[PDB]
Design an enzyme around this catalytic site. Structure first.
Site, PDB file in Angstrom:
ATOM      1  N   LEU A  32      19.644  26.748  -2.739  1.00  0.00           N
ATOM      2  CA  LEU A  32      19.869  25.370  -2.549  1.00  0.00           C
ATOM      3  C   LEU A  32      19.615  24.617  -3.867  1.00  0.00           C
ATOM      4  CD1 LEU A  32      20.576  25.184   0.270  1.00  0.00           C
ATOM      5  CD2 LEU A  32      18.220  25.071   0.819  1.00  0.00           C
TER       6      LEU A  32
ATOM      7  N   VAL B 271      16.114  23.413  -5.447  1.00  0.00           N
ATOM      8  CA  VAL B 271      15.322  24.562  -5.324  1.00  0.00           C
ATOM      9  C   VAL B 271      15.392  25.506  -6.450  1.00  0.00           C
ATOM     10  CG1 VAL B 271      15.621  24.512  -2.890  1.00  0.00           C
ATOM     11  CG2 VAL B 271      14.726  26.512  -3.950  1.00  0.00           C
TER      12      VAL B 271
ATOM     13  N   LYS C 258       6.507  29.468  -4.141  1.00  0.00           N
ATOM     14  CA  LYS C 258       5.633  28.855  -3.195  1.00  0.00           C
ATOM     15  C   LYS C 258       6.157  29.075  -1.821  1.00  0.00           C
ATOM     16  CE  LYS C 258       4.658  26.750  -6.988  1.00  0.00           C
ATOM     17  NZ  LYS C 258       4.563  25.780  -8.083  1.00  0.00           N
TER      18      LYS C 258
ATOM     19  N   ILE D  99      -6.041  -0.766  -4.072  1.00  0.00           N
ATOM     20  CA  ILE D  99      -6.452   0.293  -4.953  1.00  0.00           C
ATOM     21  C   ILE D  99      -5.281   1.187  -4.810  1.00  0.00           C
ATOM     22  CG2 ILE D  99      -8.088   2.265  -5.298  1.00  0.00           C
ATOM     23  CD1 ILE D  99     -10.242   0.718  -4.224  1.00  0.00           C
TER      24      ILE D  99
ATOM     25  N   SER E 263       8.561  -4.152  14.315  1.00  0.00           N
ATOM     26  CA  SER E 263       8.634  -3.487  15.591  1.00  0.00           C
ATOM     27  C   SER E 263       8.091  -4.430  16.662  1.00  0.00           C
ATOM     28  CB  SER E 263       7.794  -2.253  15.561  1.00  0.00           C
ATOM     29  OG  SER E 263       6.618  -2.660  14.915  1.00  0.00           O
TER      30      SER E 263
ATOM     31  N   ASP F 264       4.392 -10.115  10.110  1.00  0.00           N
ATOM     32  CA  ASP F 264       5.449 -10.565   9.155  1.00  0.00           C
ATOM     33  C   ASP F 264       6.263 -11.653   9.748  1.00  0.00           C
ATOM     34  OD1 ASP F 264       6.764 -10.101   6.637  1.00  0.00           O
ATOM     35  OD2 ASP F 264       7.148  -7.986   7.387  1.00  0.00           O
TER      36      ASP F 264
ATOM     37  N   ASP G 208       1.768 -11.527   6.495  1.00  0.00           N
ATOM     38  CA  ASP G 208       2.773 -11.870   5.515  1.00  0.00           C
ATOM     39  C   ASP G 208       3.666 -13.012   5.888  1.00  0.00           C
ATOM     40  OD1 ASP G 208       1.671 -10.077   3.854  1.00  0.00           O
ATOM     41  OD2 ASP G 208       3.407  -8.673   3.794  1.00  0.00           O
TER      42      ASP G 208
HETATM   43 NA    NA Z   1      -4.675   1.101  -1.367  1.00  0.00          NA
END
Ligand code: NA
Ligand code: NA
EC number: 2.7.7.7
Length: 327
Positions: free
Chosen positions: A54, A57, A64, A98, A172, A184, A248
């Site tokens: 493929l 690949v 692996k 972070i 959703s 949101d 938001d």
């Molecule tokens: Na974060």
DNA sequence: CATCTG
DNA sequence: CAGATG
């Protein structure tokens, strides 16, 4: 979808690491295409060599794949699940504000836990502080029954500030869903559109009412068209106060609301198909508009929309209630 | 993509 | 301004 699941999972593990821990965006991107292609791939991969066949690949991955197929595991995977450094990074990252980068710096200064963080609050910025302060709250899903309470507040508040606003809670929450991650709100105003030279007070006014009545508690980021904050349903008759939730608020030129609202409402699969169908019907769509497609290849010019209805109509399709916007 | 930081 | 984060 399940026939090459592990493989796709390891690959995904591997990739995440390259990117998060190493700085290996190349390798990182490498793992991704690979999973992506093995993912479509119609058969049971029985060997590395088979896989190699493929695109995406290569030799290393084929390798692996063998050890993983050979034995239920991968050494590398094993060594990485241990490695405290790697893990500290996957962990700090959970704090809002972070990211990998900040993670790396923190760990190398030896901050590898929540407590580390608290001790060193000074080396953290506003967003990050906030993110730490509500680590818990923010990881807590948001139950629909709470959503309807939030929604109700927001809508009534925007209304008082100006009858002319049009607010919509997407996600959703909108497509039905029992709980959700954050709130949101898609905001618009008649007096704000595509050409119209701004109106910053447009957003700032709402944000301000929200804090006036204490619904919004902290600001993560406040721009002229996008606001990132923290809200909280008032604690009733004290015994049970609510978790702090992420919210938001975004301003959108009226001339492009329903396209956004459509889009933001998802689901990702929904969009895709709708988008793919649009293309069939001689059209283009995106986050802001729907455009009649020329035959020269492409071509534009913003068709005009008044509701999510307009959009469907155009591509001549069945109006779908948010609920069935699933896939 | 829009905002923030330094 | 580049670079990080959501
Ligand atoms: Na974060
Ligand atoms: Na660069």
């Amino acid at each position: 979808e399940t026939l090459n699941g592990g493989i796709t999972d390891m690959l995904t593990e591997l990739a995440n690491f390259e990117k998060n821990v190493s700085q290996a965006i190349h390798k990182y991107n490498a793992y991704r295409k690979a999973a992506s292609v093995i993912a479509k791939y119609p058969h049971k991969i029985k060997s590395g060599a088979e896989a190699k066949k493929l695109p995406g690949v290569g030799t290393k991955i084929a390798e692996k794949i063998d050890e993983f197929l050979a034995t239920g595991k991968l050494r590398k995977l094993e060594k990485i699940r241990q490695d405290d450094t790697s893990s500290s990074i996957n962990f700090l990252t959970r704090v809002s504000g972070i990211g990998p980068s900040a993670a790396r710096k923190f760990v190398d200064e030896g901050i590898k836990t929540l407590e580390d963080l608290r001790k060193n609050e000074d080396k953290l910025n506003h967003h990050q502080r906030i993110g730490l302060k509500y680590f818990g709250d923010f990881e807590k899903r948001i139950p629909r029954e709470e959503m309807l309470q939030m929604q109700d507040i927001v809508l009534n508040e925007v209304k008082k500030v100006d009858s002319e606003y049009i607010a919509t809670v997407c996600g959703s929450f909108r497509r039905g869903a029992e709980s959700s991650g954050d709130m949101d709100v898609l905001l618009t105003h008649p007096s704000f559109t595509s050409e119209s030279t701004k109106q910053p007070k447009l957003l700032h006014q709402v944000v301000e009412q929200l804090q006036k009545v204490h619904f919004i508690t902290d600001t993560l980021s406040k721009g002229e068209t996008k606001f990132m904050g923290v809200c909280q349903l008032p604690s009733k008759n004290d015994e049970k106060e609510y978790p702090h939730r992420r919210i938001d608020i975004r301003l959108i030129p009226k001339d492009q609301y329903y396209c956004g609202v459509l889009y933001f409402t998802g689901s990702d699969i929904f969009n895709k198909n709708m988008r793919a169908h649009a293309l069939e019907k001689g059209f283009t769509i995106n986050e802001y508009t729907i455009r009649p497609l020329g035959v020269t290849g492409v071509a534009g010019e913003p068709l005009p929309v008044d509701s999510e209805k307009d959009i469907f109509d155009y591509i001549q399709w069945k109006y779908r209630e948010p609920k069935d916007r699933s896939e």
